[PDB]
Amino acid sequence: AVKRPAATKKAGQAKKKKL
Amino acid sequence: PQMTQQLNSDDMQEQLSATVKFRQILSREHRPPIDVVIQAGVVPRLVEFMRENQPEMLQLEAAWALTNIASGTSAQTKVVVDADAVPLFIQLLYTGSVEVKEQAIWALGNVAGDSTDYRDYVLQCNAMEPILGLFNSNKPSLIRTATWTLSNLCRGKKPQPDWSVVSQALPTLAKLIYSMDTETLVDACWAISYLSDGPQEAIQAVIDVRIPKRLVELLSHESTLVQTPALRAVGNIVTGNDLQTQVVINAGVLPALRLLLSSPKENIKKEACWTISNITAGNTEQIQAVIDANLIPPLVKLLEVAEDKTKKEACWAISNASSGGLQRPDIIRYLVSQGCIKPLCDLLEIADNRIIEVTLDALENILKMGEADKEARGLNINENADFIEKAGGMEKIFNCQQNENDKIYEKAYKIIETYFG
Numbered sequence: 001a002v003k004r005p006a007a008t009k010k011a012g013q014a015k016k017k018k019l
Numbered sequence: 020p021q022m023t024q025q026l027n028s029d030d031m032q033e034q035l036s037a038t039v040k041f042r043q044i045l046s047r048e049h050r051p052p053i054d055v056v057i058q059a060g061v062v063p064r065l066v067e068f069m070r071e072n073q074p075e076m077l078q079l080e081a082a083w084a085l086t087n088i089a090s091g092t093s094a095q096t097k098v099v100v101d102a103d104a105v106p107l108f109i110q111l112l113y114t115g116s117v118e119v120k121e122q123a124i125w126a127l128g129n130v131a132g133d134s135t136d137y138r139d140y141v142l143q144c145n146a147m148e149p150i151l152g153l154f155n156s157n158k159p160s161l162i163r164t165a166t167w168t169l170s171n172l173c174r175g176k177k178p179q180p181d182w183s184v185v186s187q188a189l190p191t192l193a194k195l196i197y198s199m200d201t202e203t204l205v206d207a208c209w210a211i212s213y214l215s216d217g218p219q220e221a222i223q224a225v226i227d228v229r230i231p232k233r234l235v236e237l238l239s240h241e242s243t244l245v246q247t248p249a250l251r252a253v254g255n256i257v258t259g260n261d262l263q264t265q266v267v268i269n270a271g272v273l274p275a276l277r278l279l280l281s282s283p284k285e286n287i288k289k290e291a292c293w294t295i296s297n298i299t300a301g302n303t304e305q306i307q308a309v310i311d312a313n314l315i316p317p318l319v320k321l322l323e324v325a326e327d328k329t330k331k332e333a334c335w336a337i338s339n340a341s342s343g344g345l346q347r348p349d350i351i352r353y354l355v356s357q358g359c360i361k362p363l364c365d366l367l368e369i370a371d372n373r374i375i376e377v378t379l380d381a382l383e384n385i386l387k388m389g390e391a392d393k394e395a396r397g398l399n400i401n402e403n404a405d406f407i408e409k410a411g412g413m414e415k416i417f418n419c420q421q422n423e424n425d426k427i428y429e430k431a432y433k434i435i436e437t438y439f440g
Contacts, residue, residue: 001300001339003258006293010251011174012209014132016167017090018083018125019046 023059031074038068038080045087053091062088062102069107069123075116082111082122089129096133105130105144112149121161124153128168135178142172142184151191159200166195166206173213182221185214189228196233201242208237208248215255222259231256231270238275243284250279250290257297264301273298273312280317285326292321292332299339306343306350315340315357322362331374334366338381344388351388355403360385364412372424379430382407382416386438404438413439 025037041061045051067073068081085104089096104126111123127146131138150172153165169192173185188210195207211234215225225231237249253272257264279291295314299306309315315337322333337359344351359381366378389403407413416439419431 001342003297003300004293004335005258006251006254009176010212010248012167012170012206012248014171015090015129016125017046017051018086018122019048 020059023061026061026064034068035074035077035080038065038077038084041065042080042084042087045084051087051091053088053095056084056088057095057098062098066099066102066104066107069104069111071110071114075119078111078115078119079122082108082119082126086122086126086129089126089133093133096130096137099126100130100137100140105141105146109141109144109146109149112146112153117156117158117161120153121158121164124150124161124168125164128164128171131168132171132174135175135180138172138175138180139178142181147172147184147187151188154191154195159203162195162198163200163202163206166203166210170206170210170213173210176213176216179217182217186221186224189214189224189230193228193230193233196230196237201245204237204240205242205244205248208234208245208252212248212252212255215252219259219263222256222263225252225256226263226266231267235267235270235272235275238272239278243282243287246279246282246287247284247290250287250294254290254294254297257294261301261305264298264305268298268305268308273308273314277312277314277317280314280321285329288321288325289329289332292318292329292336296332296336296339299336299343303343303346303350306340307347309340310350310353315354315359319357319359319362322359323365327369330366330369331371334363334374334378334381337363338377341381341384344384348388348391351385352392355385355406360403360406360412361410364407364410364415367412367415367419372422372427375419375422376424376427376430379416379419379427379434382412383430383434386434390438401438408439 022037022040025033028034041056065081065085068077085099089099108123108127112120127141131141150165150169169188192207192210198204214221234249234253237245240246253267256267276291276295279287282288299309318333318336322330341351341354363378363381367375385403389401393401416431416434420428422428
């Protein structure tokens with residue numbers, strides 16, 4: 001059949017503040 | 020200016036007291052005065068306190084402060100990047116103490132996660148080597164930040180990062196997922212989902228370093244912060260060929276997917292349906308394995324009562340499996356006995372044209388098997404045609420004949436004329 005790559009992208013937080 | 024004075028001062032004890040100050044003002048939970056600090060022009064001065072010759076304590080506060088400046092808008096980040104702070108951040112990973120490395124690694128995280136170019140930049144600076152070298156430490160806080168920064172260096176698929184460079188992290192990553200620390204487990208999984216997003220070579224590299232087995236365990240991890248990126252990663256792996264997909268199957272991914280289909284989170288169910296559809300796009304044995312794992316019943320319910328985005332994913336999974344009936348007819352007879360026909364028809368009046376096209380393919384496969392059985396046995400009627408009619412499905416396949424899409428009408432036409440004349 002057909003293997004489909006994901007259409008919606010995903011990732012964690014691009015940046016973080018240190019406290 | 021009382022602070023800025025002590026910063027630009029030649030007094031050793033004054034320059035530290037002033038650094039501590041700028042740090043704390045930018046370490047506030049509320050809106051940090053990020054622009055007021057840059058306004059004072061104290062950037063290159065704090066970059067200057069990250070050089071070999073500075074006290075351990077002055078490098079710690081200087082780097083800390085510089086980190087929360089990069090953690091702002093792209094502009095506030097570019098102010099730190101051009102003050103040539105990157106290469107000084109990297110060296111500090113080689114020469115600073117633990118406390119100091121924790122500050123410089125974090126800062127490299129914000130700089131790498133700002134854009135595909137600052138990412139490539141930090142990598143061109145050869146920061147991969149010293150970063151991987153950091154994991155020879157046992158300090159969880161240091162490990163967490165290093166995993167997150169490492170995370171940001173693998174991220175980004177548009178301008179894809181250098182593979183001969185980031186594939187170097189795999190060995191480290193393979194050890195990291197055996198960590199008991201939740202946060203660490205989250206970033207390790209994100210990094211792996213990024214790396215798994217490539218071609219058949221990448222996927223195979225993730226497989227060679229032996230990540231699949233533990234990654235599957237992580238699907239049933241306690242926190243959903245772990246499950247999401249782990250699921251995505253396992254998902255990307257099954258976009259590979261049949262042999263690669265089999266590896267994930269042998270690691271027990273199917274029972275794990277059954278659990279995820281009942282997840283309180285809606286997006287996890289969606290990605291679990293997606294993942295299963297790429298498994299039913301496999302060979303006979305793999306479709307048969309999905310069936311044995313008992314995945315169809317909960318997949319059929321989702322096809323009838325769930326968010327349209329999930330229903331679509333479920334549709335692919337069942338539709339893909341139905342194409343397997345040619346080599347093994349019980350596959351389709353099984354789907355039918357589980358009530359896939361009604362939920363399938365009910366999806367014919369949806370807005371998406373590609374889903375309608377995929378739904379109609381499933382129904383045709385079901386009609387075909389129904390016809391072969393009619394002739395093979397001594398039947399007078401195509402039983403799957405009746406099921407479809409009684410489910411109000413024949414009226415909908417009929418309306419599809421008036422859909423502007425070509426492939427749809429032409430197919431909806433073949434069905435009506437061939438099975439409902």
